[PDB]
Amino acid sequence: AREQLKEGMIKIEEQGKKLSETRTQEELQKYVAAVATFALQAGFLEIGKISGEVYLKLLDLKKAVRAKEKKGLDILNMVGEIKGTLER
Amino acid sequence: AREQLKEGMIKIEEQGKKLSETRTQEELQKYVAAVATFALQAGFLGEEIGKISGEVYLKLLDLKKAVRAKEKKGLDILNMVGEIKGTLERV
Amino acid sequence: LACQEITVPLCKGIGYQYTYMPNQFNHDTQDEAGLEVHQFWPLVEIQCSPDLKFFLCSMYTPICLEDYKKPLPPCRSVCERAKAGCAPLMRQYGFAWPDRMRCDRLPEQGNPDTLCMDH
Amino acid sequence: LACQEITVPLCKGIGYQYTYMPNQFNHDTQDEAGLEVHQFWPLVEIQCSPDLKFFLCSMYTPICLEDYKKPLPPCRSVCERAKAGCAPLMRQYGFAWPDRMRCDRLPEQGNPDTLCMDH
């Protein structure tokens, strides 16, 4: 019986780990590199206005990613407090 | 040359899909089930456990709010990568 | 019966937003009733029965309507569905169906004296 | 001659927040310099060189310091590192290293006569 409760706890920690996992920037950096590569092939170096609009949107995209990363971090703190509350 | 830019475009579309993917709430259901099972095995149903059981459920509801909040930001990322694809269409 | 907006976290978004006090268990405040429904939270989150959250809340935080000033409890079918789904799991952990939640205390639909709610 | 807070988006968070106008390119406003430095964003975002973002901004928005009220350029090593990392990628797409950013015009680090920046 006591062993069953111990395995239940590591199962909670396992599910909490994937819930709190963010890892968004690794996908973000790959995206920004793909856009910048396309920007080079299109000759971004009248097109200047297009190049300016792309970079401004990318900065807004990066903000949202950090915002999503911040909420993901808040989730990481909450699952830690739940594990602490369950230890008592 | 034009085909290479098309391949550059599909590379962007592929990375945007993995960037915009959130799926946080689907992972949440497994967690809440794992916690609720532990609550049953510890005998949360019914002296100190009454206060502990109340504190756990209140934290879960805040967690569910944060998950729903993180899910909302994922849509904002999905909306922005759509606008970026449109701006790239002018090329 | 003066309607008060439901503040019990477990009973928000169940279908109605207003309740009254005291309830069938003589709870004078929602905070008093909230302390007992939250003791059932592990059963609710596991989802052994889709009617469990509504059945519990329909008794601890009974619906309040300013147009219809009569108490309406949950029908017997709501109780029996929640029991058939969750009582086996409850019995597996050594907890019986509370006597305060006995289904025979509720009215059947079609009852001339009182009306009850079921989907 | 009075230090001005950097408003160019590409040059925020580089290590210093204050610059001055006009710069070495005789840009009267930051908006004029911003429209020209932002054309290098694909090279910066690919991250062909970690020193590229600092090198570009150190010229278009040169650092302004209350202790040293004289222009302080980047060291040649900063230019040479940024050049060695990104110029090959530039040449592959048909763009040469701009003459205005030739490293030989900058001072080398370790000279007591003139000071330069190398983070």
Curated annotation (Swiss-Prot), chains C, D:
Coiled-coil features, chain-numbered ranges: none
Domain (FZ) ranges: 1-118
Disulfide cross-links: 3-64, 11-57, 48-86, 75-116, 79-103
Residues reported to bind hexadecanoate: 39-46
Subcellular location per the Swiss-Prot or TrEMBL entry: Membrane; Golgi apparatus; Cell membrane
Record's comment on post-translational modification: Ubiquitinated by ZNRF3, leading to its degradation by the proteasome.
Tissues in which the UniProt entry reports expression: Most abundant in fetal kidney, followed by brain and lung. In adult tissues, expressed in kidney, heart, pancreas and skeletal muscle.
Spans annotated as Wnt-binding: 63-68, 115-118
Highest taxon above the source species: Eukaryota
Residues bearing glycans: 17
Record's comment describing the protein's domains: The PDZ-binding motif mediates interaction with GOPC. Lys-Thr-X-X-X-Trp motif interacts with the PDZ domain of Dvl (Disheveled) family members and is involved in the activation of the Wnt/beta-catenin signaling pathway.
UniProt family annotation: Belongs to the G-protein coupled receptor Fz/Smo family.
Physiological role: Receptor for Wnt proteins. Component of the Wnt-Fzd-LRP5-LRP6 complex that triggers beta-catenin signaling through inducing aggregation of receptor-ligand complexes into ribosome-sized signalosomes. The beta-catenin canonical signaling pathway leads to the activation of disheveled proteins, inhibition of GSK-3 kinase, nuclear accumulation of beta-catenin and activation of Wnt target genes.
Subunit composition and interactions: Component of a Wnt-signaling complex that contains a WNT protein, a FZD protein and LRP5 or LRP6. Interacts directly with LRP5 or LRP6; the interaction is promoted by Wnt-binding and signaling and inhibited by DKK1. Interacts with GPOC, RSPO1 and RSPO3. Interacts with glypican GPC3.
The name this protein goes by in its record: Frizzled-8
Natural source organism: Homo sapiens (Human)
Span of the entire protein shown here: 33 to 150 of 694
